[PDB]
Structures are given as structure tokens and as C-alpha cells.
Design a protein around this ligand. Sequence first.
Ligand SMILES: CCS(=O)(=O)Nc1ccc(OCCOCCOCCOCCOc2ccc(NS(=O)(=O)CC)cc2-c2cn(C)c(=O)c3ccccc23)c(-c2cn(C)c(=O)c3ccccc23)c1
Ligand SMILES: [Cl-]
Ligand SMILES: [Cl-]
Ligand SMILES: [Cl-]
Ligand SMILES: [Cl-]
Lengths: 105, 105
Amino acid sequence: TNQLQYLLRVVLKTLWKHQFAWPFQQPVDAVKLNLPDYYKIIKTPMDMGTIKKRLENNYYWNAQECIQDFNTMFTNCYIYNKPGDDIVLMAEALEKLFLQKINEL
Amino acid sequence: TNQLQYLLRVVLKTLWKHQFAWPFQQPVDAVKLNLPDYYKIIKTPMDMGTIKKRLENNYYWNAQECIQDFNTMFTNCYIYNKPGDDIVLMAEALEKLFLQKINEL
Ligand SMILES: CCS(=O)(=O)Nc1ccc(OCCOCCOCCOCCOc2ccc(NS(=O)(=O)CC)cc2-c2cn(C)c(=O)c3ccccc23)c(-c2cn(C)c(=O)c3ccccc23)c1
Ligand SMILES: [Cl-]
Ligand SMILES: [Cl-]
Ligand SMILES: [Cl-]
Ligand SMILES: [Cl-]
């Protein structure tokens, strides 16, 4: 079974319908959210809308490159936000689901 | 001074750049937010993205029709949510600003 295909049809598909997914479906808009230094602190922004476009448009060399984009999404969230913030609890729940889907591949 | 023009160039513009505006810039997406009764309770959904489109596309008969869309946006929020919810504090702050700009015509 092709792993990029699985990341698109299973992993992304599963994360996207999760009740905590909506803050991660598009780039963090630091201007609208009034987030100071977000772009100073987060040098490589990432989100599942960008990942979806990259899967649909042949961007990735391999599955590991797409997995590291998911991980960049999670770690950006942990780096910027304080532990126990709602957004961090949401990211952690999605990351657990992501790991479950990746471990079944 | 034409009131619809003022609603577009001053009132909407001022609310839109407010730090609490981003939840109101597009329709409430009840499936993504997991609000499984929103459309049963809210029969006339409204948001500032819809208002912007209506102002830009000649929808309104007059300024009172547009002001009632703003008011529908606020009252939808008060009807659906708990008093003291974050979204309600945000709507109330925007509504104060809206009233300030409307009172200054
Ligand atoms: C410009 C937004 S974005 O493009 O950047 N996306 C986005 C959104 C939230 C994000 O954080 C989520 C937590 O934020 C804290 C700010 O307090 C939240 C207070 O709000 C309550 C939710 O209210 C809405 C939000 C969006 C949307 N719209 S919608 O289309 O229906 C949604 C499906 C609608 C509502 C909403 C509107 N009404 C009128 C309602 O009656 C209502 C009733 C119940 C539930 C929701 C609503 C982030 C984000 C992502 N990451 C990775 C970060 O590290 C991060 C770090 C700091 C702050 C934010 C983030 C990104
Ligand atoms: Cl999807
Ligand atoms: Cl969960
Ligand atoms: Cl605008
Ligand atoms: Cl304020």
C-alpha cells in the first residue's frame, strides 16, 4: 500500500473530520489573531490545508517529508503556545490520532 | 453622506480590523464546530462576510436593512451561546464598537 496515498486518503481524511481539527485547517493568521512575534518565533508555518494541497499537487518526494510537515504543525503549536492552552490540548489530541493512524501503516 | 457607503467604508471596515472580529468574518460552520443544533435554533444565520458581500453587490434596499443584518449577527450569538462565553464577550465588544460608529453618523 502506497504511503503518500494512505496519508491523503486515511490520515489527513481522519484528522480533518475530528472535532478539534478546524484551527489547523488553514495557516495561523497572526494578523487576525493579533499574535505578536508568531512569525518571528515560528520560522516554518505549517497546517493541514497546506499539507492537503501538497498531497493533491505532487509536492512531496516521499511519505517522510509529508510526515515531517504534520510534525512541524504540532511542534509549532507547542513552541508558540503555553502548555495547557486550549489550542495545545487540541493539537495534542490530533497528534495522538495522527500517531494512531501512522502506526496502522 | 450616504449611509450605505458609510456602513461599508467606516462601520464594516472598523469592525473588521478589530481583534475580536475574526469569528464573525464568515458564517458559523456548525458541522466543523460540532454545534449539532445551531441551524435548528438559528433560523437566519448572519456574519460580516455575508454583509460585506451584500454591500459590495448592491443587495440592500437601504441602510436599515444592512443594520438589521448586523443586529441579526449579534442576536444570533446571544441566543445560541451561554452568557459570559468568550464568543459572547467578543460579540458584545464588537456590538459596542458598531453602536459607536452608527451613533457617529
Ligand atoms: C483568523 C483565524 S485562523 O485562519 O488563523 N484559524 C484559527 C482559528 C482558531 C485558532 O485557535 C483556536 C483557539 O483560539 C483562541 C481564541 O479564542 C477562541 C474564542 O472563539 C471561540 C470560537 O468561536 C468561533 C471561531 C471561529 C469561527 N469561524 S468558523 O468558519 O465557523 C470555524 C470552523 C466561528 C466561531 C463562532 C462564532 N460564532 C458567531 C458563534 O456564535 C460560535 C458559537 C460556538 C462556537 C464557535 C462560534 C487558531 C490557532 C491555531 N494555532 C495552530 C495556533 O497555534 C494558535 C495560537 C493562538 C491563537 C490561535 C491559534 C487558528
Ligand atoms: Cl480532506
Ligand atoms: Cl479525542
Ligand atoms: Cl473589509
Ligand atoms: Cl474593546
